[PDB]
Amino acid sequence: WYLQNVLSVELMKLPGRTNAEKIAIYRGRKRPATWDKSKEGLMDDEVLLKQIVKERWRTLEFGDRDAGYPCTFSDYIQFLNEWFKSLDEEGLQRLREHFDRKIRPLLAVMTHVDLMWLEALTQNSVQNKEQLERRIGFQTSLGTPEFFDMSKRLRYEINEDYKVRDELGPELFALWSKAPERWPPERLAKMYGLDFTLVRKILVWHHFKACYDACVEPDWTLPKRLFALEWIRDVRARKQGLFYGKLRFAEQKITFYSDKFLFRDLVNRREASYANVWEMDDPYRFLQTEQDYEDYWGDNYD
Amino acid sequence: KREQWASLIQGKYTPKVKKYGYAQHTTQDDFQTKEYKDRLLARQYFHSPQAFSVIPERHERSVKFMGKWEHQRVCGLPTADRDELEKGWGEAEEISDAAVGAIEQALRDISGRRPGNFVKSPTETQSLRLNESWWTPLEFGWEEHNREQMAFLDSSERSIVEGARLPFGGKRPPFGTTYGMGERISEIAADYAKGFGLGPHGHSPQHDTAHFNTLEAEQQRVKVLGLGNALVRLFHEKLGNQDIQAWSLQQCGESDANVRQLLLSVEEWRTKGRAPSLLLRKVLQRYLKEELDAFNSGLPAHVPRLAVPCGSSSAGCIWVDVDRNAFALEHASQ
Amino acid sequence: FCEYVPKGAPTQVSLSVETPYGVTRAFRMTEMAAAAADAERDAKGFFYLPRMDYDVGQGVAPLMSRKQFDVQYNVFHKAAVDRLNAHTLGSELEGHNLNVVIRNSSFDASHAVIHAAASEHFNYCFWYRSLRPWGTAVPARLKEELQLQYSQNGTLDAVKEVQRLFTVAALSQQSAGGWVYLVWTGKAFDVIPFDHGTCPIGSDLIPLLALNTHESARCYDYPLAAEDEEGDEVERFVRNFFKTCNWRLVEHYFL
Amino acid sequence: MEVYRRIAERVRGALWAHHRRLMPERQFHRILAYVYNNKYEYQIRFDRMSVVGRAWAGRVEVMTTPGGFLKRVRVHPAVEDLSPAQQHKLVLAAYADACQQGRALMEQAELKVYKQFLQDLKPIILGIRDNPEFYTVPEDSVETIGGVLRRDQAPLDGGAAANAAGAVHRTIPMARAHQPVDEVRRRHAWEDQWLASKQGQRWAHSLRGKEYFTRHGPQYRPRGAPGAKTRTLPFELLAPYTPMDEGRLLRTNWVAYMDSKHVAESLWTRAKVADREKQLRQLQERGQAWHRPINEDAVQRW
Amino acid sequence: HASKADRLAGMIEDAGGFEVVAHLGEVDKEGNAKVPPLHGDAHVPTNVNFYEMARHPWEDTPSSTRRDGFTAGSKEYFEQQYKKAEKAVYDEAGRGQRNYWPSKAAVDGVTGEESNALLEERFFAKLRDAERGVESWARQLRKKAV
Amino acid sequence: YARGQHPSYDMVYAGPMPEIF
Amino acid sequence: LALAAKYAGLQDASEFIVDGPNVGLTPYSGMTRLLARPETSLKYPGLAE
Amino acid sequence: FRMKLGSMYVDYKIVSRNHRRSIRVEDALVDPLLPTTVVPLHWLEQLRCPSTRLLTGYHTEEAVYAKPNYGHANAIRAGPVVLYITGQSIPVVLNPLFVQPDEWGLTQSNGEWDLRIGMDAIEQCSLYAELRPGGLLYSKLPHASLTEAMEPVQDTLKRYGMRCALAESPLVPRPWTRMRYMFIDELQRGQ
Amino acid sequence: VDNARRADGTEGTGQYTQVRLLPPEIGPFQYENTLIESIETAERFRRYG
Amino acid sequence: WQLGHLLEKCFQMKDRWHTSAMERCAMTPIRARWVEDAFADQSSIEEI
Amino acid sequence: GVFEAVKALRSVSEIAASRGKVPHSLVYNIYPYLEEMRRRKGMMAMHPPGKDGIFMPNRVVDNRMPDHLKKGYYDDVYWKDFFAGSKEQLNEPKMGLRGDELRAQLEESQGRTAKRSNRRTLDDVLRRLGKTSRDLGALQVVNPRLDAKLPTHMKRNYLLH
Amino acid sequence: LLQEYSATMPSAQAEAQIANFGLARALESEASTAIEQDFRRNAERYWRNVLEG
Amino acid sequence: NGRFSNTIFINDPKRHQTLSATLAKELNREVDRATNGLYSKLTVLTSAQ
Amino acid sequence: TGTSLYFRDTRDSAEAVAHAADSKGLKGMDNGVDLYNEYKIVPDLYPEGFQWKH
């Protein structure tokens, strides 16, 4: 079934494209004189392709071979039990990421209402699916039929300015991949106008996606050399406390620095001198004494 | 390469989208010679040997030799030698003064005041559209849209949306009543209908001291001026009862011009106020001449003299530019 | 940057066509213009120059020139205000809208000063409102009503009769020192000759059109034609005003 | 940097005010960040260089990178004989020469950054004035709720004309749409006439022609060499006709679209407010505008 | 001096210190200046064009506007299908003139070679011919499950 | 750094140690 | 010091005496750039000197 | 790692352990023929920094016999001396040989001290990938066959098992779908 | 006048090699949309022959 | 704004008892004209 | 008591601003600021010389073309007939559309049926044939529910094409 | 200009020959009593012949 | 020092607010401490007459 | 009211052009140099909250 209805791309067939349908799109989106398309019609042929796979998935129901039931729950889970145990460790990465790309944001938003509805997926009647739906009939008459679905609960998020759907491909990757030292983060920090500790957060994922896109092994110690200042503190913050873990706001000190306390730190910076640029952006500028060097490098035993 | 492309699926017609940065589609070879390619093949191979084998065996990690932290020594794409990165770069094509002097001349143009921005045209304050589930049921154009339907179209082919059948009756609900349902609409409405840009007085519309539209002064201003044109007022008088589709035929012979080219200019000039086309400028000239010198007869010397755009002559428009929709509702009576 | 610039100066990029003497000589004119913000603040009155909707930098289209509009708007009408703003204080009519100060000061010997300037204040004010520069066509809501009354069974003498009826109404202003209005008398439109210092409001009527017969309305531009045609430039005047008339307004006050 | 933040401030506003389009928040952040690396590139190739200064006859000479990090201090033995302050008042004197020349150089090299940057915006800036809908009412005419009022008449104290016009230029051919690409290809084709002609043959074989294709033979860079390996065609960008990002927003969620709108609107107002602040100073310098507001009804009676 | 007043003492001290050059600024009585000085070689840089350093990756144009791309081929095939559909609606009798009012069967009728047959006959078949030779225990089993 | 003219980087300029993985 | 600050607030009693010649020293104001500037000369002919 | 005449020349910075003392070098060769990189004894004092961790300037100071590629107590070995290379971020920490400019003679050209980084350092930086076949360093490596010395990486990998190029076969899933999504919690769905 | 170089070639000594077409910025009116390309095309042809 | 809202009302002059004749002025029209007759557009002191 | 003992509590942040002093935890947010001043040396701190960054309006520019030239204005560069039905880009919306699309508009606008005159429109005719609206394809009428001569239907829509 | 005047004008005037004359004969159809009497009597008949014709 | 806006009073009435090398060597030190402060939205500069 | 302060350098037409002085921005050398992260240095007495209006 999977090969017949999911991988057989030729077996997929899109709604017929008439001349009026064609000219519409070529004057609609390739030439989008009328810019936007925000509606629900049989057009754009791309959501439908993923939809056709999706709708084929929804129609699927685990059952006998005596009837039009395509596959048996035993045979189904057998296929997974067969293929899961055939998964390459890298395939686990794609799976583990898939479990979190889709399922985890669903199972987080779940209540008692959805319990009956979850079983309809695996077509696996467990305790009671007839009497319980009337309990859901109670909440659903007092609940919008659109929101109570599981598919729609995540339709909105924050910060549509930088989206994950576009930032997969690392920007400027052709340049900073050639000689990574030539590109300290302060060069690409401006490329992301988000909060700083956030911009240096996403910059890690940019490096890790960049490497995998080129199959090379990713620099596992970039974040530590990236969040150097962050790292050197906690290593100390750990070696003062009796707790093991990261530093939350609570255990941070309660000092009240004056309004002008870093002035000497400023006229230092506002009057710094650097012979070659790399000196200015060196990754070990943070490291002044041995007490620093011992901690920063205390990670890599090597 | 020689033969034709085709879609494996039946009836696939829209291009699949590829984005910049996606390594699937990058062709940026700036320091990628053959040696770097083979040097790139090096790091790629010793990490994922199954990626290259036609039939890949199950890929797994074995012990690494130099040490557990061997990613330090192998990670990252191979490096190009440093000097080529610095001096191996073409000279930047010289951007002369005029290439700038014209751009800075091309940038100062876009700083002009576009009329639709300060006091937003009504057509664009109620043209808001959201894919949200709540938005469309309270069809938002209902008020102005009905007017445009009514007087700018015939009674047979105009869809008029009634107000009472609307969700809230089509007006703002009383404030403290509806759980915040209605308040967000007008708020959202105002958030799309608030102006911006340096108005006539010289400040933002949201300025703390300069407030325009005091007691509908600008509203009473347009109400007494009237969005019209002396040149139109003369022509539409001279046309009289006849339809342009009849009048135009007379004006343009078999080989003078394309009446469509002309008659179209009359439609967006008689109504939907704009400047009349150079074609229309000439056509109106032979036609309107006898009207002007009857119009412009008793004028004193210093006053401007009405004449088509082509001894002080200045067209009969006191409006620099009227929006295409307000000129309509005025001139929907003519 | 319109607030800071004096009341009348231009606003643009200097072409450097002016030498040092070009600039510093202009600066004084900006300097002495500060005397306005002084004097206007000390001469500020309850009544004022009513602002014209249509911009009048260019003279009113075909009817008037700008030279002719400097006199009435900036010199005479102001002088019609300055009298009122002066005499209103101290009198019981101090601090009242026009429609109150007109009637109460109307038709009495001593108060005639107010009724002179005030009833003129509205007069000169309405003459600005009636002029739309390039003229507008009479809305159909009126072109039917004017047609009913002023065609004694003619071929649409709707405005054509109105024009002549003004010329007879203006020539009848034998003083050539009065006003001419097309007043709604509650039953019938009829142009009434009005002496300066008396407006139709004092007569309780609803005015619709304002037409100036004062020489200062035509003094600079129109008698030039008179000196060449020897008939009536005022007839040539009235025939030119209706190329600038505003029936759009008289529609609002029709209802 | 800063000045580029002011140009990119308007170009994000103009791209909305003239055409109701949203520049995606990341694209706007690149133009700044794309410029910052450009100066960061310039900054590198400087650091190999060095500048010299002389305060006394030659008795003091300081060799310094164009940035300001003094590499070498070359002192005559006599200068050391001097008092400390006289040592100080000499080194700090020649160093001033070292930063003086270090200024004029990075002052010219700065222009190159500026000019190259305008080349970046020419696709966008010229693109929003390459459209039939780029009407700008005069900079002096009164707006009004029913449309822009008269030109403010150009007061007409001139007589002959001496002020009577509104110079309503056009910037686009009326009949045939001439995109930039249409010209550059004709240009690219125009060189073909030369290359094929014996005149060009004799010129291309000349030493002078060889430096031409050296710079402008990009189609013949050896594969893998830095630069564009093909014929480089400049962008056409009809901003009112090419859906930038706003279509995506209204698809996903209003609250971002109205926000990203209000960002564009204020950024446009802020530009014009600056565009007023210039005249706010200009008219004051030409002696035509007072320091204190004298025209009160122009800010109040409206 | 408003800034570099203080650190200069330290700046010299670490940058290499005072190196003493005998007869550095000395001018010979003949006119020569002994000890030819260090020379300023700094020049306005000529090879820095970050725009040509990072281009639109496939169509290398020194730009910064992020505009998405339609994959080559899937754009051309897309266009080639439009003209073939354009050719149907607006120019029906081959007269070439734009017929603004098209025929119903011309409005709704599909493109001639819209439904790819070559891909079937030139590729799908050539696969099926080799498919005919697969083992008998397989071809049925393939047909069976599918 | 020994003369105190060098721009410092204390632990005090540390933000949150973010969960990347 | 008074005018070179980007925001210079003048009160009524503020008087700028630039007098250096009476003390015999060329007037060391640092302000003369605000004087030598053409706006000073073009507005007020010869005030700067 | 600038290559000249097909020889890997590197720039680096040799630094003491406490980073109080440091020496800069202009161009040094990469020499896997060496078992340990060797520096002038003239430096030993100039890279010596007493520390509370190592009171004597270095952890170990010893004089030994060594002179390969120079043309008993010949040369002094000392450690640990960290070595900052320019292009490579991580620093390699070496125990080199401190030698007079004659024993492992150095000033060969007109002032060129003939510095050459040994296998001691390359095993611990990004230069280690140069050792891999196809890298810039493969040729100099100690295979004496003289063929298998310059044969391309393909001819090595086709021997090793690289049958077809990366992701060419449709049995291997193309690696650039390894992470279809990056889970930044703040950017999407909020915290 | 021909740009006179000697180490570059025998290009010029001060002689006139071609009648200089006036700056195409200020020549006959070209639409400013094509003004950028023409300018960048004009100088390049003047400069490289 | 906080800094701007400050200046706009008390610093940049307003409708209170501010009349440009009132602010302490050293060069009125007449005083400023005299300067032209003495120090405007002249080379040296001896001629001045 | 205890609830009052909590209501009395003031936060660390509340204490901080009160004492006019930045708290220790909230100073990492200044670190990026200090980074620019540190990395502003040389090129980055030297503005474009002679360039203000703010440019005033220097012309009165408008490229608003007539409608007829606007129709086939973009013939070559794009897909023929640009301004198909764009009310916002074109002054005349219905200009240039093909026979069905204009019909589609009035078919989606679709003023519902009512009682008719004996001069019953083609809408009545096309329904008695089962050819409701798209099936007068070659026919020039664009609004099927209108009672006028066929030329009157065509003469009104000769501009639109 | 002139080299293009003689070039495009006859080809531009050519479409005018068809575009002007096209709408022209539409008007005479309206005022023609033939079509006019047909539309009034029974438009259905008037609508039949055109549909099939 | 207000909560946000610092103040600086030149306190030298005896010497008529004149700046020897004593003051100035701290004025460009203190007014910098004021301006380059963190919360200093505005440093009002005046004299403590 | 107040956005006139991002361009106070323009008040001196010479120095606005001359660009000798570094300072050009309100809160620093540059106006929006660190627009996103600097302002958090006020203690968040009055936070934003849950102002999502979807």
Q: Is the dihedral of CA I3, I8, I11, I13 positive or negative?
A: positive
**Nearest CA of chain I to the CA of B110: how many Å?**
13
What is the rounded distance in angstroms from the CA atom of residue A201 to the CA atom of residue A195?
Answer: 10
**For B213, how many CA atoms within 13 A lie in the half-sphere containing its CB?**
14
What is the rounded distance in angstroms from the CA atom of residue D95 to the CA atom of residue D53?
Answer: 7
Quote the strand ranges of N1-47, DSSP E.
none
What is the rounded distance in angstroms from the CA atom of residue A100 to the CA atom of residue H188?
Answer: 13
**CA dihedral of D164, D170, D176, D181, whole degrees rounded to 10:** 160
**What chain K residue is nearest to M2 in terms of C-alpha separation?**
K20
What is the rounded distance in angstroms from the CA atom of residue D99 to the CA atom of residue L39?
Answer: 93
What do you get for the CA distance between the two ends of chain K, in Å? 84
Instruction: Specify whether the CB–CB gap between D276 and C1 falls below 8 A.
Output: yes
Task: Find all residues with CB under 8 Å of H59, minimum gap 6, and list them.
Answer: H17, H79, H80
Cross-chain Cβ contact C65/B303 below 8 Å: yes
Beta-bridge partners for H98: H39, H76
Task: Find all residues with CB under 8 Å of B83, minimum gap 6, and list them.
Answer: H2
Count CB neighbours of B175 within 10 A: 10
**Nearest CA of chain N to the CA of J10: how many Å?**
14
The answer, yes or no, to whether G and H have at least 3 beta-carbon pairs within 8 Å is no
The answer, yes or no, to whether L and B have at least 3 beta-carbon pairs within 8 Å is yes
Going by their DSSP bridges, the two strands D168-169 and K60-61 should be labelled as parallel
Q: How far is CA C174 from the centre of its chain?
A: 20
**For D50, how many CA atoms within 13 A lie in the half-sphere containing its CB?**
14
Q: Which of F3, F6, F11, F13 to mutate to test the interface with A (most CBs of A within 10 A)?
A: F11
**DSSP code, position B185:** H
What is the rounded distance in angstroms from the CA atom of residue C189 to the CA atom of residue C208?
Answer: 9
Q: How far is CA H48 from the centre of its chain?
A: 22
Going by their DSSP bridges, the two strands E19-20 and D70-75 should be labelled as parallel
User: H/E element holding D265?
Assistant: helix D254-285
Task: Give the three-state DSSP class for E75.
Answer: coil
What is the rounded distance in angstroms from the CA atom of residue H139 to the CA atom of residue H136?
Answer: 7
* Orientation angle between helical segments D25-47 and D84-125, nearest 10 degrees: 140
Q: Does E7 contact F at CB distance below 8 Å?
A: yes
What is the rounded distance in angstroms from the CA atom of residue K79 to the CA atom of residue A23?
Answer: 10
**Nearest CA of chain G to the CA of C5: how many Å?**
16
Q: Which of C54, C182, C255 is nearest to B226 (CA)?
A: C54
Cross-chain Cβ contact G37/N14 below 8 Å: yes
Beta-bridge partners for B85: none
Q: How far is CA C241 from the centre of its chain?
A: 12
Residue identified by tokens 């490229």 is K63
What is the rounded distance in angstroms from the CA atom of residue F10 to the CA atom of residue F13?
Answer: 6
Cross-chain Cβ contact G46/J32 below 8 Å: no
Burial class (CB in 10 A: 0-12, 13-18, 19+), E145: exposed
Q: Could you tell me the two tokens for K101?
A: 């699309």
**For B186, how many CA atoms within 13 A lie in the half-sphere containing its CB?**
11
Q: Does B22 contact A at CB distance below 8 Å?
A: yes
What do you get for the CA distance between the two ends of chain J, in Å? 50
Task: Find all residues with CB under 8 Å of D175, minimum gap 6, and list them.
Answer: K69, K73
Task: Find all residues with CB under 8 Å of G7, minimum gap 6, and list them.
Answer: J7, N8
User: H/E element holding D80?
Assistant: helix D77-81
The answer, yes or no, to whether F and C have at least 3 beta-carbon pairs within 8 Å is no
Task: Find all residues with CB under 8 Å of C21, minimum gap 6, and list them.
Answer: none
Q: Assign 3-class secondary structure to chain G.
A: CCCCCCCCCCCCCCCCCCCCHHHCCCCCCCCHHHHHCHHHHHHCCCCCC
- Could you check whether the bond before residue H80 is cis, i.e. omega within 30 degrees of 0? yes
Task: Give the three-state DSSP class for H73.
Answer: coil
Chains in contact with I, where contact requires at least 3 CB pairs less than 8 Å apart: B, D
Instruction: For chain K, give percent helix, strand, coil, nearest 5.
Output: 35, 0, 60
Burial class (CB in 10 A: 0-12, 13-18, 19+), N12: middle
**What chain A residue is nearest to B71 in terms of C-alpha separation?**
A219
CA distances for E146 relative to A7, A11, A13, A73, E135, angstroms: 12, 11, 17, 19, 16
CA distances for C205 relative to C109, C184, C191, C250, angstroms: 22, 6, 12, 14
Q: Which of C206, K13, H122, E76 is nearest to B1 (CA)?
A: E76
Q: How far is CA I8 from the centre of its chain?
A: 19
Q: Does D277 contact N at CB distance below 8 Å?
A: yes
Interface of J with C in 5-34 (CB under 8 A): 15, 19-21, 29
Instruction: Specify whether the CB–CB gap between B264 and K92 falls below 8 A.
Output: yes
Cross-chain Cβ contact N10/D269 below 8 Å: no
Instruction: Specify whether the CB–CB gap between H43 and H23 falls below 8 A.
Output: yes
Cross-chain Cβ contact K43/D274 below 8 Å: no
Instruction: Specify whether the CB–CB gap between B126 and B144 falls below 8 A.
Output: yes
Residue E11: which of A30, A172, A273 has the nearest Cβ? Answer: A273
Mark the breaks in chain H: residue after which each occurs, C to N over 2.5 Å: 71
**CA dihedral of A251, A253, A254, A259, whole degrees rounded to 10:** -140
**What chain B residue is nearest to D248 in terms of C-alpha separation?**
B131
Residue N32: which of D5, D280, D285 has the nearest Cβ? Answer: D5
User: H/E element holding C190?
Assistant: strand C189-195
**What chain F residue is nearest to K33 in terms of C-alpha separation?**
F13
Burial class (CB in 10 A: 0-12, 13-18, 19+), E58: middle
User: Per residue in B239-268, is it b (16+ CB within 10 Å) or e — as a string?
Assistant: beeeebbeebbebbeeeebbbbbbbbbbbb
Angle formed at CA B52 by CA B46 and CA B53, multiple of 5 degrees: 110
For residue J37, the one-letter residue type is D
Q: Which of E55, K28, B196 is nearest to D228 (CA)?
A: E55
Instruction: Specify whether the CB–CB gap between A209 and A170 falls below 8 A.
Output: yes
Write out the DSSP string of D177-205. ---HHHHHHHHHHHHHHHHHSHHHHHHHT
Residue identified by tokens 């310094």 is D64
Q: Does M3 contact K at CB distance below 8 Å?
A: yes
Q: Could you tell me the two tokens for L7?
A: 């070039």
Write out the DSSP string of D86-106. HHHHHHHHHHHHHHHHHHHHH
Q: Does K155 contact N at CB distance below 8 Å?
A: no
**What chain A residue is nearest to B24 in terms of C-alpha separation?**
A213
Residues in chain N with CB shorter than 8 Å from the CB of J5 are 1-2
Angle formed at CA A18 by CA A16 and CA A20, multiple of 5 degrees: 140
Instruction: Specify whether the CB–CB gap between N41 and K32 falls below 8 A.
Output: no
Q: Assign 3-class secondary structure to D9-30.
A: HHHHHHHHHCCCCCCCHHHHHH
**DSSP code, position A13:** B
Instruction: For chain C, give percent helix, strand, coil, nearest 5.
Output: 50, 10, 45
The answer, yes or no, to whether F and L have at least 3 beta-carbon pairs within 8 Å is no
**Nearest CA of chain E to the CA of B11: how many Å?**
6
What is the rounded distance in angstroms from the CA atom of residue K30 to the CA atom of residue K37?
Answer: 12
Residues in chain M with CB shorter than 8 Å from the CB of J2 are 41
Write out the DSSP string of L1-53. -HHHHHHHHHHHHHHHHHHHHHHHHHHHHHH-HHHHHHHHH-HHHHHHHHHH-
What do you get for the CA distance between the two ends of chain L, in Å? 47
Which segments of chain A does DSSP mark as H helices, in order?
Answer: 2, 19-25, 47-59, 73-84, 89-98, 104-107, 115-122, 131-141, 173-176, 185-188, 196-214, 222-226, 228-240, 263-269, 277-281, 290-296
